[PDB]
Design a protein around this nucleic acid. Structure first.
Lengths: 539, 489
DNA sequence: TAATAATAGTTTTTAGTTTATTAG
DNA sequence: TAATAAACTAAAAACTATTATTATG
């Protein structure tokens, strides 16, 4: 119900200048933090923000450490976020010409967090790294910082101009940025910070290093803010005598927009004189107004209509009975199809905590079904109102605790039965061998998985699942442009948008020649249906 | 393609069906009548676009457009209406039979050629595209014998003629369906099973057509056109309709937001859109809203290839989407669709792609997994060759997973519950389960359309069968709860 | 001056709605 | 105690079913 973020920024001179093509890492930082914070504020998150500027004149920090926490200035301290801070971030922050110690900024921000602990519910908190590691710093602070992180317990996040691992487009899907062309000062900076953070967390910290580019592509900047969904405890009892009480968790979900769009007057820009209504007139040879309460909700049955009032359906409807996770039977893991999955959300199964008998029971069950490659069938009942479903449950293995994938399954009246001509044996479109070889050339020439070392080395050259849905960020960017520029038209598509969505360029460059062979080998035509703007501002 | 599968039942009336072989079983007559009821029922809520008709021969009065004898129509071809069932069903039962013996009559002679001719003429009257024409015969006899063989000859001629016409014939056993005393004459006319026509399948529905014709885009330059098919989708209760209290007539609906300041309704120009964030009232037009939503033109922006070896299998966003190539803008498309599918052995490398179902909708990522053709040994094709679109998750989708790894079960339990589970196995017939709810709705609607109170509550395995499977396994599981303290209490 | 040639009329998914109903 | 699943609403497309053009006389 609360989260705490504190943004400490470097405003030195190295932030200002950068290698051409590898744009100023400070502007990468400002853009990433901007869409971060606007997502925080749009999502009405019960959040909390503190803004600090170090490497700038003065010390807005409450404590200068005997004037040793110098050039450390808190900008907007711990208060509920607003557009003021973000507009200052995008615009009113300017490149500077000097630096300070980032660790001192970290400790004073922690101290500000400590100051703001009373009166307000204190749940969680985070710190993120924004420094190109060219400032001046000591090396004897390791004890105090390690003790603060091991006691004050704030999660850390790193960012770099480069990554831990022309063509370098923006840091999105492009060639890896060099990991050995940096200055040595940045080398000891990265070494010491990675040491301190692995001491904070451990081995998984080694993966916790990221960059501005990574935040652009991946969602680690956004995973440090999180919201758990409610448990759905249920009795997954298997049979008619034994009982198993466990909980349920929505795992995958079509996450849509939550905020609606009111319809507004153009003049008052309000809602009062905008009342939406209908009158429910009556269809006759003459128009006749009829009260809304002069109606019955019938249905089209046969070639006529059977009136079916609510008081009817309410007492002939399907009287289901409560939430349930009973098992119908069992079938082979082959006796299911990806074409056959059904529903709208993957729901993941977990044993209810505080009941370890259920834990061992389901652990045994999942192990067994894993051994037998045998999938189960469950009638999924949600409540006293949701009509039941039928769904498959099968084990999902992982290095941690396993789980049980549950998916809704279709019904006999849900299958759609079409027929299609069999083109595997086409007497009119049998593919030529030249076509076949061109096909093989295209298949092999381009691919998005890098297989090497024969060590199950599967790395996706275009890892999609880590991408968020662009509609939201586009919405937000337009929101900023509109709310900041009352009389300005809509902004462009924010090319970073495409850059995230563009496929790796080396693939198309390498497979263009196979593409040329295709365009040479195959016959193609065109047709109508091209859509255009009618009237255009010629000038 | 379009077209209608009209059908007509033909029922014998020679008093042989008026008697139930002097036993408890239903009369052949009344079993046939119940069959007709069942077919109307299964037709109305499956496709109210077919046609149906029923004619009785071996009758006393004669009703038909041709004034022929021993022929008694009841319903010319029409969409199956509840009125039809209302009128028919009063003829069923013992009392309906005996009162039908008098309200119309009870057995007579006939001439089969005439009745066949009459049915043909009945079909000729229709003015629609008739996809499939069928005459299915309800009779108890074997064949006319005490007639002139000229009658049989005329029957053979007329039957061959109808077979020429494109009329498909079926014949039902009445006296002893399964007794196998039929077909010493019909061996060369037609081209029991009526129980299947009875209450075994119901509450079905069918569609024919395709989804949006979307452009597959593999490069900025060359083009390729495909088709989209959604071989599965949730069935919902068909939308209601707003009647009157008592006219049972749909009422109109004028619908706008109004304003108190004036008697004139609002205007689409006057309407504005906004979102409120306290101090912020971001004012937008619907147009700029759509512009916000839109990113690029509809089509399949190909991303690249990914081996099927592993993408994931636990993720799901939407029902799968079948793809079938089709000339929509470009000819010979199936030429490129002839391959990529003959051998998925190295074509199993799937096709990551950017998908846009229609105008302006922010795209997703689609897994264009090939699925090769299978053939059923009855020369039947299910799961046709091609592609299924598996919608791909985005980062924002994977909601928080609470982390709880505490304890693994002891191996003495895993084999023991392997023995537990192995006893029960259901082949998973995909047709073996049904939505109880829509079916219940359907039966209710059938009830109110007629004089049936609500006599329909049958389960279709949606409820657990473990009411008997519990004792089927026996009780081995009970001692197989070796957790000393029961998690329940 | 008989031959074609763009086109609007039904369904139908979709999908943003609004709404109850367990819940803290 | 608000999530949320469900009933509820427009909205776009296909598969139709047709009508404006010429044509040649």
């Amino acid at each position: 119900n609360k989260a705490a973020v504190v943004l400490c920024m470097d405003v030195g001179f190295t932030m200002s200048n950068s290698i051409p093509g590898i744009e100023s890492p400070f502007e990468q930082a400002k853009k990433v933090i901007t869409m971060f914070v606007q997502r925080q504020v749009f999502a009405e998150n019960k959040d909390e923000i503190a803004l600090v500027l170090f490497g700038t004149d003065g010390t807005d920090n409450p404590l200068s450490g005997g004037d040793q926490y110098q050039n450390i200035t808190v900008h907007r301290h711990l208060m509920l976020p607003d557009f003021d801070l973000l507009e200052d971030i995008e615009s009113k922050i300017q490149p500077g010409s000097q630096q300070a110690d980032f660790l001192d900024a970290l400790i004073v921000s922690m101290d500000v967090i400590q100051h703001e602990t009373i009166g307000k519910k204190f749940e969680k908190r985070h710190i993120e790294i924004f420094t190109d590691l060219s400032s001046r710093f000591s090396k004897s602070q390791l004890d105090i910082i390690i003790h603060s992180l091991k006691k004050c317990d704030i999660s850390l996040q790193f960012f770099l101009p480069f990554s831990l691992g022309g063509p370098f487009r923006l840091g999105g899907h492009g060639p890896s940025f060099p990991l050995k062309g940096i200055t040595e000062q940045q080398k000891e900076g990265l070494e010491i910070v990675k040491m301190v953070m692995i001491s904070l967390e451990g081995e998984d910290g080694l993966d916790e290093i990221y960059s501005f580019s990574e935040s652009l592509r991946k969602l680690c900047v956004f995973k440090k803010i999180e919201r758990h969904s409610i448990h759905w405890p249920c009795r997954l009892t298997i049979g008619s005598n034994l009982s198993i009480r466990i909980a349920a968790y929505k795992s995958i979900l079509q996450e849509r927009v939550k905020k609606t769009w009111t319809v507004v007057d153009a003049k008052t820009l309000k809602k009062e004189d905008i009342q939406k209504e209908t009158v429910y007139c009556l269809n006759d040879d003459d128009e006749t107004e009829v009260l809304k309460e002069d109606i019955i909700q019938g249905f089209r049955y046969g070639s006529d209509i059977v009136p079916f009032s609510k008081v009817d359906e309410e007492q002939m409807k399907y009287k289901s009975e409560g939430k349930c996770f009973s098992v119908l039977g069992f079938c082979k893991s082959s006796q299911v199809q990806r074409r056959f999955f059904m529903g709208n959300q993957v729901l993941k199964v977990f044993a209810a905590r505080d009941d370890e008998a259920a834990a061992v029971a389901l652990s045994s069950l999942i192990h067994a079904l894993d051994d037998l490659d045998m999938v189960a069938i469950v009638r999924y009942a949600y409540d006293k109102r949701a009509n039941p479903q039928v769904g498959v449950a099968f084990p999902h293995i992982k290095h941690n605790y396993e789980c049980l994938v549950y998916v809704q399954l279709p019904f006999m009246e849900d299958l759609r039965q079409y027929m299609f001509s069999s083109l595997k044996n086409s007497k009119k479109y049998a593919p030529t061998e030249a076509q076949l070889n061109a096909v093989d050339a295209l298949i092999d020439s381009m691919s998005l998985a890098k297989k090497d070392e024969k060590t199950d080395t599967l790395e996706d050259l275009f890892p999609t699942t880590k991408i968020p849905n662009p509609r939201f960020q586009r919405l937000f960017q337009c929101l900023l442009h509109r709310a900041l520029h009352p009389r300005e038209p809509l902004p462009p598509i924010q090319q970073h948008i495409w850059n995230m969505l563009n496929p790796p360029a080396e693939v198309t460059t390498k497979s263009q020649i196979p593409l040329s062979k295709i365009k040479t080998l195959f016959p193609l035509i065109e047709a109508k249906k091209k859509d255009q703007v009618t009237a255009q501002e010629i000038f | 393609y379009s077209g209608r599968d009209s059908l007509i039942f033909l029922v014998d009336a020679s008093k042989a069906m008026f008697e139930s072989q002097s036993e408890d079983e239903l009369t052949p007559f009344d079993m046939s009548i119940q069959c007709i009821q069942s077919v109307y029922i299964s037709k109305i809520i499956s496709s109210d676009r077919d046609l149906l008709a029923v004619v009785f021969y071996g009758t006393e009065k004669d009703k038909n457009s041709v004034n022929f004898k021993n022929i008694y129509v009841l319903q010319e071809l029409d969409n199956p209406g509840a009125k039809r069932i209302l009128e028919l069903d009063q003829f069923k039962g013992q009392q309906g039979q005996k009162r039908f013996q008098d309200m119309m009559g009870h057995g007579s002679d006939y001439s089969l050629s005439e009745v066949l001719w009459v049915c043909a003429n009945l079909f000729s009257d229709v003015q629609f595209k008739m996809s499939h024409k069928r005459i299915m015969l309800f009779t108890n006899e074997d064949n006319p014998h005490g007639n002139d063989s000229a009658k049989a000859s005329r029957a053979r001629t007329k039957a061959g003629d109808l077979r020429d016409t494109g009329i498909f014939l079926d014949l039902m056993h009445l006296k002893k369906p399964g007794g196998f005393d039929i077909s010493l004459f019909y061996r060369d006319i037609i081209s029991s099973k009526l129980e299947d026509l009875l209450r075994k399948v119901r509450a079905k529905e069918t569609r024919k057509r395709a989804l949006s014709r979307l452009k597959l885009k593999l490069n900025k330059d060359i083009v390729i056109s495909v088709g989209i098919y959604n071989l599965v989708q949730k069935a919902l209760k068909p939308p209601p309709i707003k009647l009157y209290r008592e006219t049972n007539e749909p009422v109109k609906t004028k619908t706008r937001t109004f304003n108190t300041s004036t008697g004139g309704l609002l205007l689409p120009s006057d309407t504005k859109r906004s979102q409120i964030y306290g101090s912020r009232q971001i004012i937008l037009e619907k147009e700029e809203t759509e512009e916000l939503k839109r990113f690029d033109d509809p089509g399949l922006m190909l991303m690249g290839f990914k081996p099927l070896v592993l993408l994931k299998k636990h993720h799901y966003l939407r029902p799968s989407l079948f793809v079938y190539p089709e000339e929509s803008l470009v000819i010979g498309s199936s030429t490129l669709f002839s391959a990529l599918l003959i051998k998925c052995l190295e074509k199993e490398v799937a096709a990551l792609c950017r998908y846009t179902p229609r105008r302006n909708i922010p795209p997703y990522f689609v897994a264009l997994v090939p699925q090769e053709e299978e053939l059923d040994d009855q020369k039947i094709q299910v799961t046709p060759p091609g592609f299924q679109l598996v919608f791909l998750p985005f980062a924002d989708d994977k909601r928080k997973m609470p982390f709880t790894e505490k304890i693994m079960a002891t191996p003495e339990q895993v084999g023991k519950m392997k023995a537990i589970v192995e006893k029960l196995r259901f082949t998973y017939r995909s047709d073996s389960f049904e939505n109880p709810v829509l079916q219940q709705h359907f039966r209710n609607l059938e009830a109110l359309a007629l004089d049936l109170m609500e006599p329909e509550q049958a389960v279709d395995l949606t409820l657990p069968k473990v009411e008997a499977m519990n004792k089927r396994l026996g009780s081995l599981v009970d001692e197989f709860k070796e957790l000393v303290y029961p998690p329940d209490y």
